[PDB]
């Protein structure tokens, strides 16, 4: 009897459906007189109309039917909204269920509450027109389109009984990120994870153009969505009387198959990739609004996308049509005199946490358990002498991540775009593997590292991975993202969205608990250009992240492996941040042992006393580095200067936290003027060697008292192919150019260092000539060790 | 007989195939002794191996077969390479055809030429490992994956007889941009445009993971690629003896269907969307290389992706295997004593421009005709009084673009992501329409503006549009891209690729002629937030573009419609640039008439004399603006100051060319120190009101003599929903905050302007309170006109 729809139940569901639309339209238009007790007048209409209408009925249409199966089958559901402009529909149902009144006591279920509820939407000092963090039961802001689908899969991970109902607009489906995220079924495990129920809201139109997926034939539509691995179900029509029964049956069909798929997998009898059920819903745009306006068809057309009538404040004719639109919902039989929904509506409202707007998963910070972090000092490489030993920088991190996975079998995951092996993080493969539910071959047994139980997820689409991870954190869990720095620009749009979400959730919204940080590891830099990656890779992603704020993002550039461990350990505890860690996978020198590394990361920036020779004296120059390749060149330059200028006093400063450079006025995390003057003196030149565009340092530290003595060398440009030393020479960040820069800046070396400066230019000439002759650097360059 | 393959022809084709692989492997490994006349020794091997091997045989496999049909059917073809790391294969065939020797006389077809040809690849001072602009017959650098498919469609536009053979790697297909660009068949007109022949190189593996599209079943593969609208053809196997004949038949089948499709369409008998032929090629990775290395299978596995044996310089065992690998191609029977290919190879080499590496389309700048630009002064709005009249800013540009389309029916196009109507550029719809070959309905007749003959292209995927336009320019044609500024971050990766391509083509490569500029119009700004677009939209894309260089990118922020016309007219003539024009679609004031606008854009920056009152005197303050909304606030602030401080002298400067602010030392285009001191004085405060992040101005103009007096107000952050004046108040760019800033900075107003400053803060309080009360600004704010 679950598939069939009772006429009595059909009426109550239809009653809820209209009330949701009525509240949606009221939010768009009304600022006063919520229930049409008195004739509508221009003083009740909002001056500026920013809400969108063409998608609201469809979202409410599915939402009331989703609540039906929750009441019947006791399903645990989440609502993820593709078109974020359909916010009123979600809020209306949130208010109808009673969630919004509990979270916001001002917007009660009364006439006075409705007045505040209607006036707040898309209003200065109110709430936005998208699925902002202020929305109860919301994890995804659909303002930027293409990421709703991935967030459904991310939230589904390690939530076996959860089902995430994600509604997808046909216009959104034309975007690149969402077209590739359909293949996420191959990495979702039916045994341990939940289900995603994709609903294609094929209203037939974008803002102003038809959607191609609507204008592509039905046969090719089913062909496209079986090739994605889904079992597609089609509900088409325009008359709700038929469509209420038809779509209730389809949703009943889908849930049984989802449970049948999960039952088959968890029993172990069918350990294969299943054909997940997906719904294709073709309904008119602006479904229950005006039919035509000024002789142009509006409903079921792109003209209904935002607002069918935007001149209602101007001419009374449309104003009467607006009031006629509202009364078509028959609000007199939907709400009582007080302003609450009628008891028929309250009957079909789910109860407590079973409500999709009050599910604690959406407010994932309440479901967040801190990771049991093993002591990273067990994985710290031994550094008996600083800078005299070479070890692979990322392998200790791989071993540390292995022990985190061991102690957090479900709460933690790894995400990587087919680069985990290249990034040299294979230590995690010792305990787990990579997720794969596609076809398997015996050749995968040797080094494939493929299993459905794996805690590491791999796909070449960077958009898919970022959406997977962001949803995983917002549901109250932990993760780590590792990728090349060359392709970081691909996810720049997605990072902005998540940073937006975190910043609002901290300051504006008070009831949303903190979630875990977004930890990103840019594992291959632009200085050590390996085989893969384009020639002109740029560090520009770092500038984009620092563009957001110091109170939501953190940038770390640890110089060695122990410093990488402390940074990763520190950032696996921080909550409301986007942590971007820039480290290189090549074999590098090691500088700090576990104790010294931990103290260095706690400060974020500090003097290296072994690399300095200014103890108990005023340094003639401060050499600072931020990165690992540029740190090596800065250290090598320091060695060269000390050989040729024995009396020269050099203070070596290494900075790991980029944002420490900002003054404490901007953010509390930054250094004070006294602290900054202690590290970098008030009047001596600073030769800063930065892994990135040099102006980023100037943007951060422009207000310091010694900024006029700050001289930053960083990434400028590249050739087609360069050796590691030649590439540093092109950007003037190599050891020889840095030594020249120190000679130019130190006042008592311009006259005295002329002969050394000529010798340094000779070395640049010799190494370039050898580079063009052999294709690599000299052995003494590659095997350079810290002297002294 | 075209379908069947002669055994004599099969041998010569196989002879070409092995020689191409041999040259490819020689480029990867050898730096000396090209032909194995003497035993291989470590001094002949390259020190560092950066080339990739797993894709080279597949590219050469298709390439030799593509040349077959050129010789038979006289087809005009282009080779677009998906995996850019497969550069050696393209270069080897380029050398084999003789193109490379003609372009590069140093690399002759001899033994001495081969020594230079082998030693140059992936070498310092040589050439890169990707499809850089130095490659003959190359339009697309496949280093960043996901854009090869779109570039095929872009180059195909308005080239009816051209066929673009684009080879697509299975790993690349997992990326977001390429998954959505498959639907580009719906916008390609068989009647007027050429064909794209997509070849899916499904080698089964990525760098280190299996490709899901390979591990998805064959049935679901055909289902996926018929849903994209393609007729898929499958060639599978590993034995070339069978695969040579099978593949040749499939390519023969595809070309006939492509011609049959074009013949049916151009006769007019079948004006429907056709099922384009697409090839799915499943071959082992590292197809003709080592079978196993160190007990691990390499060929047909991810272990062959880059280099099967990377220790050949270390141990002689692999060194013998490398020489055994080379001799498996039997080079003795492929090259003569001199070093040229044998006459059998020369027989099957195409001739002249029919060679894909020597096709003049790829060097599109030779095929570039300058647009016949109508005088924009016909579309200039009348401005009898500056700043006293309001007109829609983008509509005159739409009319101007309409006349360009009229005079350039084939050489020009418009690209937009479902925003042309929103951007208010509908004037172009008066002469043309939008491309659409999907299903048509009678409802589209009213305002659909849909026709297959349209010169405007629409799709919600911004990745697809950018790839379409870049290829269109690189083939020697013109275009204009219009989109919102909110979603500009989506195409940031693609823009970097094209900027990279232009910069190399100007300085490094000498034989590549200039092509047309990339003209981008960010038509909706972040200050006038309309219905669509997320709340926290940022101008950060401007910072990303200025990141590249002043010698390849230009940023224009015209204040009014006449400045927009002059800027667009000026930028439709420039060749080797990425032109980004930031304009707003809202109804705005108009400031300059056609004559004054043209002079202003010629300077790029200049004093507005009507808005100034410092003529013949030293100005107390310089108020500068860069944008249109911020220009209005700067002008309104100027009016407020002149009302309350009649003696105050204000010079108003408007800047359209952002890069003029850079000193002439960086680039010739920038202003000199004398010119800059003329506009902005040497010692007076400058209140700069910028449409964007304020630091961008400081990055550009830090070297100026008066930079210490430069005070920039720009975009900082947003609330959820704000009125236009309230949003400007939040960022302190409104008229009242600017007037306060002038009071603070002018030395003789700190004491004297205290009472006005208190009044200004009262206005800020009053307008915010009104905004929270009504939801819009006061009528006098919305209808503000320039006084005086
Ligand atoms: N005040 C500044 N504001 C912003 N960027 C700056 C500033 N000063 C320098 N830069 C940037 O820093 C880089 C080099 O300048 P800088 O770090 O000062 O080293 P420098 O050797 O002193 N160069 P210069 O200041 O011109 O003598 C360039 O990319 C500049 O754009
Ligand atoms: N010398 C500088 N180098 C780089 N960025 C700068 C510099 N001075 C200011 N900025 C940037 O400019 C913006 C605001 O400063 P600014 O444009 O100078 O206005 P302001 O009122 O003068 N603030 P202040 O300089 O601290 O008194 C921020 O993005 C700063 O990072
Ligand atoms: C890549 C991109 N291009 C354009 C937009 C502008 N935009 C915001 S909402 C929207 C409508 C989405 O279309 P559709 O999925 O059909 O939604 P619905 O009909 O449910 O409103 C568009 C185009 C965007 N957000 N992203
Ligand atoms: C989005 C993205 N992720 C990762 C890479 C790194 N990368 C460069 S080339 C390459 C191989 C592409 O795989 P496939 O299409 O299978 O190519 P082929 O087997 O022909 O080498 C990869 C993963 C990239 N360029 N872009
Ligand atoms: Mg739609
Ligand atoms: Mg592959």
Does ligand 3 lie within 6 Å of residue A304's CB atom? no
| Distance from Cα B305 to the centre of ligand 4, integer Å | 10
Note whether A55 and A355 are within 8 A (CB). Answer: no
CA distance, residue A377 to nearest chain B CA (Å): 30
The answer to whether the CB atoms of B227 and A221 lie below 8 A apart is yes
Does ligand 2 lie within 6 Å of residue B714's CB atom? no
A312 conformational bin, left if phi > 0, alpha if psi -120 to 50, beta if neither: alpha
The answer to whether the CB atoms of B143 and A225 lie below 8 A apart is no
Gaps (C–N > 2.5 Å) in chain B: which residues precede them?
none
State how far the alpha carbon of B771 is from the alpha carbons of A31, A126, A470, B767, in Å: 14, 11, 35, 6
Q: Whose CA is nearest to atom 10 of ligand 3?
A: A207
List the structure tokens of B587: 């109804």
Note whether B132 and B165 are within 8 A (CB). Answer: no
The answer to whether the CB atoms of B128 and A720 lie below 8 A apart is yes
Task: Give the 3-state secondary structure of residue B528.
Answer: coil
Q: Of B80, B13, B75, B71, whose CA–CA distance to B256 is shortest?
A: B75
Chain Cα centroid distance, residue A375: 28
Place of tokens 């009660």: A108
Nearest by CB to A52, from B46, B221, B531: name it: B531
E-strand stretches of B7-114: 76-81
Does ligand 4 lie within 6 Å of residue B145's CB atom? yes
| Distance from Cα A201 to the centre of ligand 5, integer Å | 7
Residue of chain B whose Cα is closest to the Cα of A175: B461
Note whether A167 and A124 are within 8 A (CB). Answer: no
Torsion of CA B392, B395, B400, B406, to 10 degrees: -160
Q: How many CB atoms lie within 10 A of CB A782?
A: 12
Mutation choice for B interface testing from A54, A87, A208 by most B CBs within 10 A: A208
The answer to whether the CB atoms of B227 and A206 lie below 8 A apart is no
Question: Cα(A724)–Cα(A782) distance, rounded to whole angstroms?
Answer: 9
Length of chain B: 788
Chain Cα centroid distance, residue B728: 32
Mutation choice for A interface testing from B169, B212, B230 by most A CBs within 10 A: B212
Residue A193 CB contacts under 8 Å (≥ 6 apart), including other chains? A156, A157, A158, A159, A160
Helix (H) or strand (E) holding B582: strand B578-582
| Distance from Cα A171 to the centre of ligand 5, integer Å | 5
Does ligand 4 lie within 6 Å of residue B206's CB atom? yes
State how far the alpha carbon of B546 is from the alpha carbons of A546, B534, B543, B549, B697, in Å: 16, 24, 5, 6, 10
Strand order, beta sheet including B553-556: B456-458, B414-416, B480-484, B518-524, B578-582, B553-556
Residues of A in contact with B695 (CB under 8 A): 699
Q: How many CB atoms lie within 10 A of CB A745?
A: 17
State how far the alpha carbon of B125 is from the alpha carbons of A222, A727, A771, A772, B285, in Å: 53, 12, 9, 6, 30
Q: What is the DSSP string of A523-583?
A: EE-SSS--SSS-TT---HHHHHHHHH-TTTEEEE--SSHHHHHHHHHHHTT--S-EEEEE-
CA distance, residue B666 to nearest chain A CA (Å): 13
Residue of chain A whose Cα is closest to the Cα of B771: A124
Nearest by CB to B460, from A206, A226, A438: name it: A206
On the 0-12 / 13-18 / 19+ scale of CB atoms within 10 A, B44 is buried
**Beta-carbon-side half-sphere exposure of residue B458 (alpha carbons within 13 Å):** 28
Maximum CA extent, chain A:
98
On the 0-12 / 13-18 / 19+ scale of CB atoms within 10 A, A524 is buried
Angle of helix B754-774 versus helix B735-745 axis, rounded to 10: 160
Torsion of CA B751, B756, B761, B763, to 10 degrees: 180
Q: Whose CA is nearest to atom 16 of ligand 1?
A: A711
E-strand stretches of B99-249: 162-169, 195-201, 230-236
| Experiment type | cryo-EM
State how far the alpha carbon of B8 is from the alpha carbons of A283, B12, B14, B334, in Å: 61, 7, 10, 16
Chain Cα centroid distance, residue A777: 40
Question: Cα(A399)–Cα(A402) distance, rounded to whole angstroms?
Answer: 5
Residues of A in contact with B85 (CB under 8 A): 531-532
Question: Cα(A160)–Cα(A262) distance, rounded to whole angstroms?
Answer: 9
Task: Give the 3-state secondary structure of residue A181.
Answer: helix
Q: What is the DSSP string of B622-657?
A: EEEEESSHHHHHHHHHHHHHHHH-TT--EEEEEE-B
Residue B489 CB contacts under 8 Å (≥ 6 apart), including other chains? A492, A493, A496, B538, B540, B541, B544
Note whether A53 and A308 are within 8 A (CB). Answer: yes
Chain Cα centroid distance, residue A265: 30
Task: Give the 3-state secondary structure of residue A47.
Answer: coil
Torsion of CA B93, B94, B100, B101, to 10 degrees: 40
Question: Cα(B479)–Cα(B464) distance, rounded to whole angstroms?
Answer: 15
Question: Cα(B520)–Cα(B120) distance, rounded to whole angstroms?
Answer: 37
Question: Cα(B591)–Cα(B610) distance, rounded to whole angstroms?
Answer: 9
State how far the alpha carbon of A627 is from the alpha carbons of A59, A394, A624, B588, in Å: 48, 14, 10, 48
Gaps (C–N > 2.5 Å) in chain A: which residues precede them?
none
Mutation choice for B interface testing from A53, A85, A460 by most B CBs within 10 A: A460
Strand order, beta sheet including B650-655: B605-608, B650-655, B621-626, B686-690, B710-713
Q: Of B400, B761, B733, whose CA–CA distance to B570 is shortest?
A: B400
Does ligand 4 lie within 6 Å of residue A417's CB atom? yes
User: Which residues in B710-747 are b (16+ Cβ under 10 Å) and which e?
Assistant: bbbbbbeebebbbbbbbbbbbbbbbbbbbbbbbbebbe
Backbone angles phi, psi at B480, to 5 degrees: -150, 125
Q: How many CB atoms lie within 10 A of CB A272?
A: 11
Backbone angles phi, psi at A375, to 5 degrees: -60, 120
State how far the alpha carbon of A172 is from the alpha carbons of A177, A181, A560, B314, B462, in Å: 9, 12, 43, 53, 12
Length of chain A: 788
The answer to whether the CB atoms of A531 and B84 lie below 8 A apart is no
* Rg for chain A, CA atoms, rounded: 30
List the structure tokens of A626: 């931020």
Question: Cα(A320)–Cα(A310) distance, rounded to whole angstroms?
Answer: 13
Q: Of B534, B540, B436, B453, whose CA–CA distance to B488 is shortest?
A: B540
CA distance, residue B698 to nearest chain A CA (Å): 9
The answer to whether the CB atoms of A228 and B226 lie below 8 A apart is no
List the structure tokens of A580: 């971007």
Question: Cα(A88)–Cα(A56) distance, rounded to whole angstroms?
Answer: 7
Nearest by CB to A460, from B206, B301, B532: name it: B206
**Beta-carbon-side half-sphere exposure of residue A96 (alpha carbons within 13 Å):** 33
Q: How many CB atoms lie within 10 A of CB A291?
A: 12
Note whether B305 and B207 are within 8 A (CB). Answer: yes
Domain edges within chain A = 1-383, 384-604, 605-788
* Rg for chain B, CA atoms, rounded: 30
Residue A507 CB contacts under 8 Å (≥ 6 apart), including other chains? none
Question: Cα(B115)–Cα(B135) distance, rounded to whole angstroms?
Answer: 18
Measured from the Cα of B143, ligand 4's closest atom is 25
List the structure tokens of B276: 């384009």
Q: What is the DSSP string of A57-105?
A: HHHHHHHHHHHHHHHHH--EEEEEESSGGGHHHHHHHHHHHTHHHHH-T
Helix (H) or strand (E) holding B780: helix B779-782
Q: How many CB atoms lie within 10 A of CB B352?
A: 7
List the structure tokens of B605: 């920056």
Question: Cα(B675)–Cα(A503) distance, rounded to whole angstroms?
Answer: 43
Residues of B in contact with A210 (CB under 8 A): 436, 438, 444, 448, 450
Chain Cα centroid distance, residue B129: 21
List the structure tokens of B443: 């409802």
Does ligand 3 lie within 6 Å of residue A62's CB atom? no
Task: Give the 3-state secondary structure of residue B522.
Answer: strand
Residue of chain B whose Cα is closest to the Cα of A302: B448
The answer to whether the CB atoms of B721 and A458 lie below 8 A apart is no
Residue of chain B whose Cα is closest to the Cα of A144: B534
Q: Pick from B698, B706, B717 the residue to mutate for probing ligand 2's pocket: most ligand atoms within 8 Å of its CB.
A: B698
User: Bridge-partner residues for B553, per DSSP?
Assistant: B578
Residues of A in contact with B421 (CB under 8 A): 207-208
Rounded to a whole number of angstroms, the distance between the first and last alpha carbons of chain B is 84
Task: Give the 3-state secondary structure of residue A234.
Answer: strand
Question: Cα(A306)–Cα(A165) distance, rounded to whole angstroms?
Answer: 24
Angle of helix B462-474 versus helix B492-507 axis, rounded to 10: 10
Chain Cα centroid distance, residue A174: 21
Question: Cα(A547)–Cα(B699) distance, rounded to whole angstroms?
Answer: 14
Q: What is the DSSP letter of A174?
A: T
Q: Of B637, B635, B618, whose CA–CA distance to B685 is shortest?
A: B618
Rounded to a whole number of angstroms, the distance between the first and last alpha carbons of chain A is 84
Helix (H) or strand (E) holding A767: helix A754-774
Helix (H) or strand (E) holding B567: helix B561-571
Q: What is the DSSP string of B386-435?
A: TTSEEEESSHHHHHHHHHHHHH-TTT--EEESS-TTTTT-GGGGGT--B-
Note whether B625 and B559 are within 8 A (CB). Answer: yes
User: Bridge-partner residues for A519, per DSSP?
Assistant: A579
Q: What is the DSSP letter of A300?
A: T
CA distance, residue B62 to nearest chain A CA (Å): 23
Q: How do strand A578-582 and strand A587-590 relate by DSSP bridges?
A: unpaired
Q: Of B268, B357, B375, whose CA–CA distance to B80 is shortest?
A: B357
| Distance from Cα B183 to the centre of ligand 3, integer Å | 17
Q: What is the DSSP string of B595-620?
A: HHHHHHHHHSEEEESSS---TTS--S
The answer to whether the CB atoms of B464 and A176 lie below 8 A apart is yes
The answer to whether the CB atoms of A446 and B52 lie below 8 A apart is no
Backbone angles phi, psi at A166, to 5 degrees: -110, 120
Residue of chain A whose Cα is closest to the Cα of B536: A500
Note whether B409 and B606 are within 8 A (CB). Answer: no
List the structure tokens of B169: 């790697």
On the 0-12 / 13-18 / 19+ scale of CB atoms within 10 A, A328 is middle
Note whether B525 and B629 are within 8 A (CB). Answer: yes
E-strand stretches of A283-403: 292-293, 296-297, 389-392
Note whether B423 and B394 are within 8 A (CB). Answer: yes
Chain Cα centroid distance, residue A673: 34
Note whether A715 and A731 are within 8 A (CB). Answer: yes
B286 conformational bin, left if phi > 0, alpha if psi -120 to 50, beta if neither: left
User: Bridge-partner residues for B579, per DSSP?
Assistant: B519, B554
**Beta-carbon-side half-sphere exposure of residue A296 (alpha carbons within 13 Å):** 13
Strand order, beta sheet including A518-524: A456-458, A414-416, A480-484, A518-524, A578-582, A553-556
Backbone angles phi, psi at B327, to 5 degrees: -70, -15
Question: Cα(B448)–Cα(A180) distance, rounded to whole angstroms?
Answer: 29
Place of tokens 């008292």: A705
List the structure tokens of B351: 């001739």
User: Which alpha helices (H) appear in B267-361, and where do they start and end?
Assistant: 316-327, 343-347
């Amino acid at each position: 009897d679950i598939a069939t729809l009772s006429p009595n139940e059909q009426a109550a569901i239809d009653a809820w459906w209209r009330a949701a639309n009525y509240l949606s339209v009221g939010q768009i238009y009304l600022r006063d007189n919520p229930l049409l007790q008195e004739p509508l007048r221009p003083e009740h209409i909002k001056q500026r109309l920013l809400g969108h209408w063409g998608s609201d009925p469809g979202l409410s249409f599915v939402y009331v039917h989703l609540n039906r199966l929750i009441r019947r089958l006791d399903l645990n559901l989440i609502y993820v909204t593709g078109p974020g402009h359909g916010a009123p529909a979600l809020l209306a149902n949130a208010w109808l269920e009673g969630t919004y009144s509990e979270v916001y006591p001002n917007c009660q279920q009364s006439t006075a509450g409705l007045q505040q509820f209607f006036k707040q939407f898309s209003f200065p000092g109110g709430i936005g027109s998208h699925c902002t963090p202020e929305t109860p039961g919301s994890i995804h802001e659909g303002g930027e389109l293409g990421y709703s689908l991935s967030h459904a899969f991310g939230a589904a991970l390690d939530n076996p009984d959860l089902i995430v109902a994600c509604v997808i607009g046909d216009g959104e489906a034309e975007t690149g990120p969402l077209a590739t995220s359909w293949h996420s079924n191959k990495f979702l495990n039916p045994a341990q994870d939940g289900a995603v129920l994709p609903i294609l809201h094929l209203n037939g139109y974008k803002i102003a153009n038809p959607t191609l997926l609507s204008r592509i034939s039905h046969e090719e539509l089913r062909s496209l969505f079986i090739g994605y691995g889904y079992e597609p179900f089609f509900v088409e029509g325009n008359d709700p009387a038929i469509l209420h029964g038809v779509m209730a049956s389809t949703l009943a069909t889908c849930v049984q198959k989802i449970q049948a798929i999960q039952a088959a997998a968890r029993s172990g009898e069918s350990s294969d990739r299943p054909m997940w059920p997906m719904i294709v819903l073709r309904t008119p745009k602006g479904w229950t609004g005006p039919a035509t306006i000024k002789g142009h068809v509006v409903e079921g057309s792109w003209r209904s996308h935002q607002v069918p009538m935007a001149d209602v404040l101007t001419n009374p004719e449309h104003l009467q049509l607006l009031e006629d639109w509202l009364r078509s919902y028959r609000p007199e039989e939907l709400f009582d005199a007080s302003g609450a929904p009628v008891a028929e509506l309250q009957a079909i409202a789910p109860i407590g946490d079973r409500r999709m707007s009050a599910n604690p998963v959406t407010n994932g910070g309440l479901l967040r358990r801190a990771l049991t972090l093993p002591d990273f000092r067990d994985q710290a490489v031994s550094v008996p002498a600083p800078g005299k030993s070479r070890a692979d920088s990322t392998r200790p991190l791989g071993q540390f991540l292995r022990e985190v996975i061991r102690h957090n079998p479900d709460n933690f995951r790894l995400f990587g775009p087919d680069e985990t092996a290249s990034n040299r993080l294979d230590a995690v493969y010792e305990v787990t593997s990579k997720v794969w539910l596609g076809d398997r071959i015996p050749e995968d047994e040797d080094g494939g590292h493929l299993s459905d139980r794996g805690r590491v997820m791999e796909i070449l689409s960077e958009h898919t991975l970022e959406g997977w991870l962001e949803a995983y954190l917002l549901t109250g869990r932990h993760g780590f993202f590792a990728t090349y720095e060359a392709f970081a620009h691909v996810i720049d749009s997605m990072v902005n969205q998540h940073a937006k979400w975190l910043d609002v959730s901290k300051r504006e919204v008070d009831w949303r608990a903190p979630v875990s940080s977004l930890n990103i590891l840019l594992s291959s830099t632009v200085w050590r250009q390996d085989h893969n990656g384009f020639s002109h890779q740029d560090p520009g992603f770092i500038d984009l992240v620092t563009n957001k704020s110091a109170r939501v993002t953190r940038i770390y550039l640890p110089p060695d492996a122990n410093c990488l461990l402390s940074v990763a350990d520190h950032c696996l505890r921080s909550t409301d941040y986007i942590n971007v860690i820039v480290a290189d996978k090549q074999s590098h020198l090691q500088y700090l042992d576990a104790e010294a590394a931990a103290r260095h990361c706690a400060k974020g920036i500090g003097i290296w006393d072994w690399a300095s020779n200014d103890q108990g004296a005023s340094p003639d120059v401060v050499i600072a580095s931020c990165g690992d390749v540029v740190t090596l060149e800065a250290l090598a330059a320091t060695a060269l200067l000390r050989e040729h200028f024995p009396d020269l006093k050099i203070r070596f400063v290494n900075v790991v936290d980029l944002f420490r450079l900002q003054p404490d006025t901007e953010h509390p995390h930054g250094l004070s003027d006294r602290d900054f003057d202690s590290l970098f003196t008030v009047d001596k030149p600073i030769i800063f060697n930065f892994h990135g565009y040099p102006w980023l340092i100037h943007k951060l530290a422009y207000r310091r008292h010694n900024h006029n003595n700050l001289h930053v060398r960083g990434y400028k440009e590249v050739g087609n192919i360069n050796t590691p030393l030649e590439l540093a020479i092109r950007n003037q960040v190599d050891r020889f150019n840095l030594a020249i820069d120190v000679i130019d800046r130190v006042p008592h070396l311009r006259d005295r260092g002329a002969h050394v400066k000529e010798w340094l230019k000779d070395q640049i000439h010799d190494h370039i000539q050898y580079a063009y002759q052999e294709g690599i650097d000299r052995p003494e360059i590659n095997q350079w060790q810290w002297p002294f």
